[PDB]
Design a protein around this ligand. Sequence first.
Ligand code: ANP
Ligand code: ANP
Ligand code: MG
Ligand code: MG
Lengths: 333, 333
Amino acid sequence: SHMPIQVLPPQLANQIAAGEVVERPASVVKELVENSLDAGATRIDIDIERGGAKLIRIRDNGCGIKKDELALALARHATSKIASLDDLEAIISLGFRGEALASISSVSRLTLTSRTAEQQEAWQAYAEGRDMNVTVKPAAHPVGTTLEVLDLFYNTPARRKFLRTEKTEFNHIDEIIRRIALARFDVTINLSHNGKIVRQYRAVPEGGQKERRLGAICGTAFLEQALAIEWQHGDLTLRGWVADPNHTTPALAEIQYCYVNGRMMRDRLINHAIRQACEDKLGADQQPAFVLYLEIDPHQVDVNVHPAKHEVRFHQSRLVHDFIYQGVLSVLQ
Amino acid sequence: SHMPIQVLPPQLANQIAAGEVVERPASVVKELVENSLDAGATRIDIDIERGGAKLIRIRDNGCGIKKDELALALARHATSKIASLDDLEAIISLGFRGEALASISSVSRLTLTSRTAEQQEAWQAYAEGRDMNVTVKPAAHPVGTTLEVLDLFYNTPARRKFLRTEKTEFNHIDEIIRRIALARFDVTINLSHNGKIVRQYRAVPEGGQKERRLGAICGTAFLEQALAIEWQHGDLTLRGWVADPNHTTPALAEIQYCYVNGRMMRDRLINHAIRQACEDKLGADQQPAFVLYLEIDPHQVDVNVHPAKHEVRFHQSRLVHDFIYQGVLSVLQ
Ligand SMILES: Nc1ncnc2c1ncn2[C@@H]1O[C@H](COP(=O)(O)OP(=O)(O)NP(=O)(O)O)[C@@H](O)[C@H]1O
Ligand SMILES: Nc1ncnc2c1ncn2[C@@H]1O[C@H](COP(=O)(O)OP(=O)(O)NP(=O)(O)O)[C@@H](O)[C@H]1O
Ligand SMILES: [Mg+2]
Ligand SMILES: [Mg+2]
């Protein structure tokens, strides 16, 4: 009662939000790359310096951002991905909060450069001060977008403390890119660290062999034990690969990549079903190895549960669980 | 690119936020009770109808809300608990986002009634419409506050679907109150369902016997196996009770209540330390039974990690883990 109820200064409000969506450099990468994907990008180039605490640069050949919308992209609660509750209940894009960029710009030096196919001119924008004022200026840039995030946490001392070693932080980034690359085989992704290319996943052409990228990402060992899954029932569909439990190793078990309508996701319900199918087939229970993709009617899954979309909730939980169980169990025999 | 980047209508922006902090009636109870606690409340009366999907009423004898701040309490990003980054990095209150009430009012019919010790007059406020307009009107009410939340999710169809049975939903509420009652022995809490009292935890007086409430909440079985802990090192301090592992049952293992600076918390780091201490003492590894309280310098723990504060991150992780380990291991011998 001593302190009056008072609206929070813009920057601080954004920093509170950033603490919930941006835990480390890999988080910034996750959010920016998903934006590139939502933008229709086919090629995404990522440059990281000193694990990301120094610089994170992401360029894509997506549709770009119109000059008159640059500031809006840095504003709070502003998005082009949804505009109604109906849109929210039927999410068909990675983003929908209209918050990621504003959140990130409050805890770093973020620069947005972009040009659309209809523009001959490219522009650049960035926010500053307690009020997060945006300035827009001329720039050179092909069709698409570039995001530059520098000095992550330079203005938030306590959080910068949590940063691990350059190697460790980059490793999480590499793992994040790993998961994203497997979600979209039709997208080329290049990752560099301190001026050196660490990896490049070329997009898989039409009907091309997906095994190629799968093997390039998860390893030949997984590929040799990978059992293809094709299971469907109405809106529900399960695709991907599950390693034979009898030939799964602790190292392979490190591959437990799951997707729900293309979004990377770690769900206890799903993992339980998978493991149960393997347990009921194999002799004992263990950690399965898999890269699975669940496609389901957006109305049947709640994705508005975690600010970073790290969780989901299925309406017909028991049903979905049995679907995956049967699907996996089916292939194990 | 087809849809313009556009600021989200107020109500919808709040509904997106509500999806991340309010998963069910018990969540609404959690947020409102923590407000009552932050307000210095000594007695909190909770009335629930039909598991909370119909009505949730919480009254407290806290300090109240000044008439001219009623609207602000329903506004977004507005709080009296912090005002700077320094305040955020040294959290000493349950709330700090200035968002809970606004979020909840967007997905229910929420009414706020309150009067401060300096006011002879009491007032009532509530928000409405896509823009969340607030109206303030006269009311009768003692010193303190009352929150009324009706028809939870009446305007969000997909989410209302996730509601379980009246019994189930109330059960989560009861469990939430359980955890909160154990955090503050100095607070009286009464819980009723459909017009009937289900429980009432009278506050424990000065130096009074805490065992009383502990036994009333966790059961005599826990109390008979409860081993008191007193372990400290600088800012770090571990207090509470841990059941003898050799005499812990699956039923008792249901009691794994942990607190960090008074805030209920489920942390993997902490649970790991506890279990390890029990494992290293006992013969095998299992689920321990405990009600422990960790007090630590706010600067040493990040509580700005989850919108509902369901998680924390310790800066000196290895250290804290060893502190708890030693603390528990110490008593087991
Ligand atoms: N790489 C990009 N290419 C094209 N448009 C982009 C890109 N990144 C961001 N945008 C635009 O900027 C707006 C989004 O900023 P952002 O802060 O990421 O919110 P969001 O994607 O709408 N939702 P969320 O990610 O859930 O907060 C988007 O809605 C797009 O219109
Ligand atoms: N029961 C209460 N008694 C007195 N003041 C209250 C009570 N509930 C809410 N308030 C006031 O209303 C403002 C808070 O609304 P709320 O939306 O719960 O945000 P918060 O508690 O500030 N932060 P957070 O809970 O993290 O969103 C508080 O900061 C208090 O000033
Ligand atoms: Mg986004
Ligand atoms: Mg609050």
